[PDB]
Amino acid sequence: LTPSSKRFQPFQQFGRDVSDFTDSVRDPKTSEILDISPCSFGGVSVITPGTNTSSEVAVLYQDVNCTNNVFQTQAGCLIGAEHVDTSYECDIPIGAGICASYHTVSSLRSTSQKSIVAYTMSLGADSSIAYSNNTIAIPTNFSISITTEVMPVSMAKTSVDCNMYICGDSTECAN
Amino acid sequence: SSIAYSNNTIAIPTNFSISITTEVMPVSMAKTSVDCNMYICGDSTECANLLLQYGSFCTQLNRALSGIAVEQDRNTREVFAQVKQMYKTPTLKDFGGFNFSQILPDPLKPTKRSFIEDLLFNKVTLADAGFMKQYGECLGDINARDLICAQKFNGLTVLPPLLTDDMIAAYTAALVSGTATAGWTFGAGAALQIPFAMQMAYRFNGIGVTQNVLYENQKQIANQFNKAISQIQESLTTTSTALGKLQDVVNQNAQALNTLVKQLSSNFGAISSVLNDILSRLDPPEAEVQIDRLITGRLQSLQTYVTQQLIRAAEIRASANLAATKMSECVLGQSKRVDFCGKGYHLMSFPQAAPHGVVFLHVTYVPSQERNFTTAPAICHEGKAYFPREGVFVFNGTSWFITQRNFFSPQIITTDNTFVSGSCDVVIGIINNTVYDPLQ
Amino acid sequence: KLQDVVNQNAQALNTLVKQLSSNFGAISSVLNDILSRLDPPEAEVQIDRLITGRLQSLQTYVTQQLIRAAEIRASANLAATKMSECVLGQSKRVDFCGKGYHLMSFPQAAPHGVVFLHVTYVPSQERNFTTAPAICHEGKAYFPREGVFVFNGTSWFITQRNFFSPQIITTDNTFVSGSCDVVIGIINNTVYDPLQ
Amino acid sequence: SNVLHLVQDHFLPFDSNVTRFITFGLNFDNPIIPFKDGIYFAATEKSNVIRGWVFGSTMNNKSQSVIIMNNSTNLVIRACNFELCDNPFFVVLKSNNTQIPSYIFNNAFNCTFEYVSKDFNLDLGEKPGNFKDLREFVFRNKDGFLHVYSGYQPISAASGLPTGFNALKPIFKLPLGINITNFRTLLTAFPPRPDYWGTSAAAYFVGYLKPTTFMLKYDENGTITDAVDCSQNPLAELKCSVKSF
Amino acid sequence: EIDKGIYQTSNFRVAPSKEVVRFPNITNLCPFGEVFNATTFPSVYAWERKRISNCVADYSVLYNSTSFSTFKCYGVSATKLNDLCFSNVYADSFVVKG
Numbered sequence A: 001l002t003p004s005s006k007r008f009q010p011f012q013q014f015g016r017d018v019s020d021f022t023d024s025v026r027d028p029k030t031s032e033i034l035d036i037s038p039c040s041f042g043g044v045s046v047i048t049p050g051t052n053t054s055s056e057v058a059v060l061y062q063d064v065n066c067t068n069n070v071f072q073t074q075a076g077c078l079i080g081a082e083h084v085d086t087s088y089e090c091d092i093p094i095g096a097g098i099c100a101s102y103h104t105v106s107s108l109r110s111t112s113q114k115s116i117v118a119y120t121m122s123l124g125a126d127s128s129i130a131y132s133n134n135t136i137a138i139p140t141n142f143s144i145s146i147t148t149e150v151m152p153v154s155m156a157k158t159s160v161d162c163n164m165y166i167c168g169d170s171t172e173c174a175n
Numbered sequence B: 001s002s003i004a005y006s007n008n009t010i011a012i013p014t015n016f017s018i019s020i021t022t023e024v025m026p027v028s029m030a031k032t033s034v035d036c037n038m039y040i041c042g043d044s045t046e047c048a049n050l051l052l053q054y055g056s057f058c059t060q061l062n063r064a065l066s067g068i069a070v071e072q073d074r075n076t077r078e079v080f081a082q083v084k085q086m087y088k089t090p091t092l093k094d095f096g097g098f099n100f101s102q103i104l105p106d107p108l109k110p111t112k113r114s115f116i117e118d119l120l121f122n123k124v125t126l127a128d129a130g131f132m133k134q135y136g137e138c139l140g141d142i143n144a145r146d147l148i149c150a151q152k153f154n155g156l157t158v159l160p161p162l163l164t165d166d167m168i169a170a171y172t173a174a175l176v177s178g179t180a181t182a183g184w185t186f187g188a189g190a191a192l193q194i195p196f197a198m199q200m201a202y203r204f205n206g207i208g209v210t211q212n213v214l215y216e217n218q219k220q221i222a223n224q225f226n227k228a229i230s231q232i233q234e235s236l237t238t239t240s241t242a243l244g245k246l247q248d249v250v251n252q253n254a255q256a257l258n259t260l261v262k263q264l265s266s267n268f269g270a271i272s273s274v275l276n277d278i279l280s281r282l283d284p285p286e287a288e289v290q291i292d293r294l295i296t297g298r299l300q301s302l303q304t305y306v307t308q309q310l311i312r313a314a315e316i317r318a319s320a321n322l323a324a325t326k327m328s329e330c331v332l333g334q335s336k337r338v339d340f341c342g343k344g345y346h347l348m349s350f351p352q353a354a355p356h357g358v359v360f361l362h363v364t365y366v367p368s369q370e371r372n373f374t375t376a377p378a379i380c381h382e383g384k385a386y387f388p389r390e391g392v393f394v395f396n397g398t399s400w401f402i403t404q405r406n407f408f409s410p411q412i413i414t415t416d417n418t419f420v421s422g423s424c425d426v427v428i429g430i431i432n433n434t435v436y437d438p439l440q
Numbered sequence C: 001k002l003q004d005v006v007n008q009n010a011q012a013l014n015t016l017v018k019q020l021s022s023n024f025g026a027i028s029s030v031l032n033d034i035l036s037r038l039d040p041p042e043a044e045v046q047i048d049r050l051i052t053g054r055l056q057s058l059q060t061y062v063t064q065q066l067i068r069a070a071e072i073r074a075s076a077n078l079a080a081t082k083m084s085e086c087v088l089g090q091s092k093r094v095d096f097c098g099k100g101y102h103l104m105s106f107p108q109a110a111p112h113g114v115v116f117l118h119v120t121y122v123p124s125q126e127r128n129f130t131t132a133p134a135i136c137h138e139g140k141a142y143f144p145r146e147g148v149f150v151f152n153g154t155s156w157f158i159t160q161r162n163f164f165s166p167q168i169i170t171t172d173n174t175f176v177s178g179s180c181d182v183v184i185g186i187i188n189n190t191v192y193d194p195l196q
Numbered sequence D: 001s002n003v004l005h006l007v008q009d010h011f012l013p014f015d016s017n018v019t020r021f022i023t024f025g026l027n028f029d030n031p032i033i034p035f036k037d038g039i040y041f042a043a044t045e046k047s048n049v050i051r052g053w054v055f056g057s058t059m060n061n062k063s064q065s066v067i068i069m070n071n072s073t074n075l076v077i078r079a080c081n082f083e084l085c086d087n088p089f090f091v092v093l094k095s096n097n098t099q100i101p102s103y104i105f106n107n108a109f110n111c112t113f114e115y116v117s118k119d120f121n122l123d124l125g126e127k128p129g130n131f132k133d134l135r136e137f138v139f140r141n142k143d144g145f146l147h148v149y150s151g152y153q154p155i156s157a158a159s160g161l162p163t164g165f166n167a168l169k170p171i172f173k174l175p176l177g178i179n180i181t182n183f184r185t186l187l188t189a190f191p192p193r194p195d196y197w198g199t200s201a202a203a204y205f206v207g208y209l210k211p212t213t214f215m216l217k218y219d220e221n222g223t224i225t226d227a228v229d230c231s232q233n234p235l236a237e238l239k240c241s242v243k244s245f
Numbered sequence E: 001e002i003d004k005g006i007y008q009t010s011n012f013r014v015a016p017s018k019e020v021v022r023f024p025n026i027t028n029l030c031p032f033g034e035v036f037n038a039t040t041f042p043s044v045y046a047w048e049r050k051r052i053s054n055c056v057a058d059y060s061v062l063y064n065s066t067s068f069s070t071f072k073c074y075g076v077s078a079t080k081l082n083d084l085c086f087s088n089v090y091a092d093s094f095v096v097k098g
């Protein structure tokens, strides 16, 4: 319940939105209009390695500004993952350019324990090529490469018996 | 139009123009997820227990929506991440007189994206304007009935794309810089540096025009290239519906979520659509009949949303596959397919990042200023028939010559430009002329 | 990918089975209990609710199957196109059959799919070379015919772009057009004539 | 607030035929107008010539009737078995500008309902110029209740019903439980000379409500500012279908 | 068992901790004696309607004073009668035969 700027006519006591959800009400004892809002407004996701791999979990709250680790991403407030400045290939896509993985981090001494780490993913290898008005690169050798491409062609063909699925061996249900 | 036919008139273009056209292709669409309990029951424990007793098939719904979301991130990666190595933007952006300034990021500009890309992002108006909305923000913005707050209060969420807009523009800059420096070679294998003017000469050879046409007209072609880029820039600056295809995609996604919210005011054979009104007025036995009707109708509404989302994602997938094909065939190489990359003979293509899509600038060779000529299938020199080698015989109004079809460049008919087979009587339209021999 | 397909199919059936345990506003999902406990008039309501729910479940299954079949149809059309263009011929389309210049392709059967082995030509071990657009021999400009002018370091040659094979610049490897002043990066060199 | 609301009820259709009854000169219109399903009542007047109505079925003492007349002091709603006079009116002297007692009914018996409003002052004086005030009323009889919706607008029209839009707010829901098929307006009279009658310029308009679909528009403050008659024309039925103006 | 990845769980939920009951200020009891213990009742054709306002509808006082052979509610629940506030409530009185 919050204070509201809505004005209610003497003959009005409740107000509804486009969803017909009651969002405004005039308090009986004090004739003040109050706004009613839902208690649940969270976008929550859970990042986990394999269950057999570990039972540790990192939780992302999409709608929360962060102001153990509590790192703030553009996707949301991320809790339970260390932020590493190194850029790797994406392993678990958090979003907004942020990815997560399970990397061995020596937080204390040399523990050699694995933890969930969040990082900005690497787009690709960095390269520099020189341009001029009179240099050309001509290959002096070649290789024969063989690559694989896997393409689905068909899927399982299925049929359904209606009387069996809906009614089974029931004559009353069949009728 | 009317065109004349005869057995000996051929039209050979005497000039050409460099044309640059735009192709707008959707690539991805909004990734959405649904909270089953929030949409159907809200913050109601009585409804939640009835929804549990009721067969809840909305883990199937979220499974379908999650598959859509992963495909949307796949779509962008297949289109833009085809380059293996990121190529640094050249410090100088004028290769042989061809101005690449507009389609390359400006180091002084803070937006780290091309000038043309900035115009495209200004065209399409996005509804989300960010993927973070705090609880205090919507509470303080209750007076204005924000649609995003309304749908987020009902369990409808929009997930951010994995690749941020700056990352996609980074891929585009590497693609443009690689083409301007390494040409077509980096598309298939390691990048091989080649001068840009020679690259243009190679591409002119691909469409059947000799190299000398490019080099003798390098200043004219470069100027035509620069003016064509400017016309694209001017056309995008003025308001238009060129990017309507991308706008249509974002409109459909917002419309679907707003329809979902408005369907909560729907009765489905029940006394009221307000769950609190029913629960405040009836016993659990009598309210169970009404709540079950609201559960069934609201579940069907979510089923309809997901099914339409699946069909829409199929269309986006087909569009993104075409964009991924056009990136490999029109940008990373030269295409002989007719009308696949622009109108006219394809020279090169430049990708540009767009909101939820890609824009292709196709550079094409357009012949113009044709001239009519008298033509013969072959030449009878001395009892022997001479056929042209990669050309067509043209009278020119004075003496028979041989020229390439696309561009008119008369050449003396010699034994090098022609080959001899058979006799003179077999060919129908054969005429008599001399064939010059260099050794004579 | 192939595995994914089959997995979905299995899931699409198993879910169906589990949805038989679902009440849809009814007292129970067990038809036998309702039939053993109520008269036909009172059991009709519950049985109708169960019928509606199960029919909706079957509708959902068939719709999802239709969409998946459309996706499989698109994939199979692409596979047939690749069989026609990469296996039965040679493709000049970039990246349509493997990475690099396409040499050939070999099909292999796979469970509910096809695996294409694309044999391609990949250049390597490149070398930098001074190069010129044309050669000025005697007031005339010579442009290479299917090649590029390159500099070993001492003398000018003409070579194919993909593989380096230096050849003596002759009138057979080049063609003459125009004068020398028009070309920008034109340089001076001799053009060998076999006739002389 | 800030919504478009589609509702089906008994509404006065847009551009409907509306019969006019005037009081000026030698005609003092007091007919028995049928009530039908419901009526839209609008009075154009510069002086308080209109005082109320009498609703009933037989308009005599053989059946119950309700009178909503507004005398000079307060509003009186009286549902009784009335021996109604065939020509009921109030009387106010044109020069004296004072109200003297007048008869609407001879005798009232077996009465079932009574309501008296708070005391207020009403101006009985004749006024010059054009019509100054527009008072709009909707009367709906459903499930034993008489619903009254009222609205007021300042106008300057010399004749006819001015065009415009006005949302009437609910003022009364009278539990009468009477059969209503007819109604008669109660106007005041301005007799200059005894044994003779007179009239002051005033007009009222009667329109009949019908069950129709309307799309109401709510502004920020919750008021209704515009509406669309979805049955008026194919363009209007398009607007309601797409829920936009 | 869960494979590696990121999964969308339920939306963040807040469990209510306090109750807030707000009724208008009413100090009187409803005229149960005036309605159910009237000396005279009208005929069914001339049934009598009376308005009720500004009162607490505590029908537990009806116990031990009156006994109803018929009591049926429509549009509402009997067990819900104690937790509600009613608008425009009228009582119609008459006499019929069994």
Ligand SMILES: *[C@@H]1O[C@H](CO)[C@@H](O[C@@H]2O[C@H](CO)[C@@H](O[C@@H]3O[C@H](CO)[C@@H](O)[C@H](O)[C@@H]3O)[C@H](O)[C@H]2NC(C)=O)[C@H](O)[C@H]1NC(C)=O
Pocket (backbone or CB within 6 Å): B014, B015, B016, B017, B220, B223, B369
């Ligand atoms: C093919 O068409 C193009 C037009 O697209 C022709 O280019 C035009 O060439 C003329 C003459 O060379 C140019 O006129 C010149 O204008 C400058 C001022 O800019 C003036 O100083 C010169 O004295 C001369 O009048 C014209 O500007 C130019 N147009 C463009 C757009 O470049 C080209 O000549 C045509 N080629 C053939 C073989 O017909």
Ligand SMILES: *[C@@H]1O[C@H](CO)[C@@H](O[C@@H]2O[C@H](CO)[C@@H](O[C@@H]3O[C@H](CO)[C@@H](O)[C@H](O)[C@@H]3O)[C@H](O)[C@H]2NC(C)=O)[C@H](O)[C@H]1NC(C)=O
Pocket (backbone or CB within 6 Å): D071, D072, D073, D074, D076, D099, D116
């Ligand atoms: C307009 O109609 C109203 C309602 O009928 C009149 O108000 C009521 O008029 C009656 C009769 O004059 C009043 O009864 C009188 O009460 C006094 C004591 O207050 C008593 O001494 C008299 O013998 C008589 O019984 C009644 O009180 C009065 N009520 C109110 C609220 O004022 C009103 O007078 C009428 N005005 C006219 C004639 O324009």
Ligand SMILES: *[C@@H]1O[C@H](CO)[C@@H](O[C@@H]2O[C@H](CO)[C@@H](O)[C@H](O)[C@H]2NC(C)=O)[C@H](O)[C@H]1NC(C)=O
Pocket (backbone or CB within 6 Å): A028, A029, A030, E025
């Ligand atoms: C009904 O009673 C409540 C409780 O007495 C009143 O609320 C209080 O009113 C006093 C005087 O206005 C204030 O000083 C208190 O701060 C109020 N407390 C609350 C609970 O807000 C309420 O005003 C009364 N309402 C009516 C209809 O008179």
Ligand SMILES: *[C@@H]1O[C@H](CO)[C@@H](O[C@@H]2O[C@H](CO)[C@@H](O)[C@H](O)[C@H]2NC(C)=O)[C@H](O)[C@H]1NC(C)=O
Pocket (backbone or CB within 6 Å): A065, A066, A067, B132
């Ligand atoms: C979260 O809130 C903070 C403010 O509390 C926003 O800005 C940060 O403010 C602090 C303190 O002034 C600065 O030291 C930081 O540099 C600010 N920037 C960031 C990005 O941390 C912050 O922008 C908010 N984050 C979001 C995404 O809403």
Ligand SMILES: *[C@@H]1O[C@H](CO)[C@@H](O[C@@H]2O[C@H](CO)[C@@H](O)[C@H](O)[C@H]2NC(C)=O)[C@H](O)[C@H]1NC(C)=O
Pocket (backbone or CB within 6 Å): B094, B099, B100, B101, B102
């Ligand atoms: C390539 O095009 C850009 C844009 O037309 C040129 O940049 C402009 O240069 C002129 C002259 O210096 C300035 O007046 C403009 O303000 C510049 N515009 C921008 C956007 O920077 C650029 O000079 C061209 N490059 C070449 C050498 O052709």
Ligand SMILES: *[C@@H]1O[C@H](CO)[C@@H](O[C@@H]2O[C@H](CO)[C@@H](O)[C@H](O)[C@H]2NC(C)=O)[C@H](O)[C@H]1NC(C)=O
Pocket (backbone or CB within 6 Å): B380, B431, B432
């Ligand atoms: C091209 O030349 C040939 C031979 O010089 C011409 O063929 C001769 O035509 C004349 C005219 O009728 C005949 O009398 C000869 O018998 C032909 N000679 C042979 C070997 O057939 C031919 O007519 C010439 N074509 C043109 C168009 O002038």
Ligand SMILES: *[C@@H]1O[C@H](CO)[C@@H](O[C@@H]2O[C@H](CO)[C@@H](O)[C@H](O)[C@H]2NC(C)=O)[C@H](O)[C@H]1NC(C)=O
Pocket (backbone or CB within 6 Å): C152, C153, C154, C155, C166
């Ligand atoms: C320039 O190209 C020529 C031709 O390939 C190279 O000259 C050859 O060098 C080898 C080794 O000394 C000799 O055995 C051949 O007889 C030479 N051929 C000719 C035609 O002279 C030379 O190596 C190249 N220059 C550089 C710097 O690589």
Ligand SMILES: *[C@@H]1O[C@H](CO)[C@@H](O[C@@H]2O[C@H](CO)[C@@H](O)[C@H](O)[C@H]2NC(C)=O)[C@H](O)[C@H]1NC(C)=O
Pocket (backbone or CB within 6 Å): C136, C187, C188
């Ligand atoms: C290629 O040879 C030509 C002619 O042998 C050179 O052109 C001459 O250059 C000199 C030097 O300035 C001038 O004085 C002459 O007038 C030019 N002759 C003509 C006909 O224009 C040319 O410079 C040579 N190129 C190189 C790169 O050495």
Ligand SMILES: *[C@@H]1O[C@H](CO)[C@@H](O[C@@H]2O[C@H](CO)[C@@H](O)[C@H](O)[C@H]2NC(C)=O)[C@H](O)[C@H]1NC(C)=O
Pocket (backbone or CB within 6 Å): D060, D061, D083, D107, D109
């Ligand atoms: C009901 O109204 C009728 C008609 O006005 C009354 O009948 C009149 O009664 C008077 C005596 O009170 C006679 O002088 C008239 O001649 C009668 N007229 C007619 C047409 O019959 C009747 O008395 C009224 N009943 C009441 C007041 O209860």
Ligand SMILES: *[C@@H]1O[C@H](CO)[C@@H](O[C@@H]2O[C@H](CO)[C@@H](O)[C@H](O)[C@H]2NC(C)=O)[C@H](O)[C@H]1NC(C)=O
Pocket (backbone or CB within 6 Å): D219, D220, D221
């Ligand atoms: C709702 O009511 C408020 C308050 O009467 C209106 O705000 C006033 O509008 C008038 C006319 O524009 C201004 O002169 C006042 O200064 C405003 N006061 C305030 C508190 O801002 C508001 O315009 C009304 N809204 C609508 C659309 O009817």
Ligand SMILES: *[C@@H]1O[C@H](CO)[C@@H](O)[C@H](O)[C@H]1NC(C)=O
Pocket (backbone or CB within 6 Å): A052, A053, E001
């Ligand atoms: C999980 O990992 C452990 C250790 O490698 C292995 O023994 C176990 O079989 C794995 N289980 C699954 C679910 O793959």
Ligand SMILES: *[C@@H]1O[C@H](CO)[C@@H](O)[C@H](O)[C@H]1NC(C)=O
Pocket (backbone or CB within 6 Å): A132, A133, C184, C185
């Ligand atoms: C080639 O580039 C260099 C460095 O910018 C410059 O000095 C030289 O003059 C250029 N030559 C040509 C052919 O433009």
Ligand SMILES: *[C@@H]1O[C@H](CO)[C@@H](O)[C@H](O)[C@H]1NC(C)=O
Pocket (backbone or CB within 6 Å): B003, B004, B370, B371, B372
């Ligand atoms: C070629 O011939 C056609 C048909 O007569 C004519 O329309 C066209 O203008 C001619 N073009 C030239 C350049 O002569």
Ligand SMILES: *[C@@H]1O[C@H](CO)[C@@H](O)[C@H](O)[C@H]1NC(C)=O
Pocket (backbone or CB within 6 Å): B396, B397, B398, B399, B401, B410
């Ligand atoms: C072509 O025709 C023109 C005009 O008849 C003539 O001047 C020219 O010499 C002919 N030959 C060439 C060089 O194309």
Ligand SMILES: *[C@@H]1O[C@H](CO)[C@@H](O)[C@H](O)[C@H]1NC(C)=O
Pocket (backbone or CB within 6 Å): B007, B008, B428, B429
């Ligand atoms: C072209 O057609 C005309 C009309 O039939 C004919 O006279 C002429 O000889 C033909 N020329 C050839 C054979 O090309």
Ligand SMILES: *[C@@H]1O[C@H](CO)[C@@H](O)[C@H](O)[C@H]1NC(C)=O
Pocket (backbone or CB within 6 Å): A130, C126, C127, C128
């Ligand atoms: C060509 O030059 C570049 C530097 O500009 C260098 O990295 C590359 O290895 C050279 N290639 C060869 C082997 O000539």
